[PDB]
Nucleic acid binder design. Sequence first.
RNA 1: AGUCUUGGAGGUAGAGCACUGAUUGGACUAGGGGCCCCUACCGGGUUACCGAAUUCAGUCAAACUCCGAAUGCCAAUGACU
Length: 58
Amino acid sequence: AKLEITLKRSVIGRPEDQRVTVRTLGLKKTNQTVVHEDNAAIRGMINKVSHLVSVKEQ
RNA sequence: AGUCUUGGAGGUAGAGCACUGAUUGGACUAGGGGCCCCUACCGGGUUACCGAAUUCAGUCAAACUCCGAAUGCCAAUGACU
């Protein structure tokens, strides 16, 4: 069940852990988009950084 | 490296008096210097003090603990980089 994750806010001014999580998710520029397969690990990652991310289930 | 699951040391935020104090509301007031009388007599009790207790709280503890989080630390398995 692929789902799309979009970076909606810049990372400038954020603590290091949130930046590392966002970078590990694959996002590198604002307004980027990427697809991943839905499981508990991805949901936890989204939960950590959710104010900088918009999730949509295609 | 980040995330998920499982395991593990810890005595703080809170709360509480089981322990130590703080103490006071005050008790508990012995028993004495002393007070009524002294003591011309020791003291009967206050003791107007000490302070042995003890009294039931109330709280109180940056150097009190029967109790105790959230997060952070230390290792193990899938994803993800």
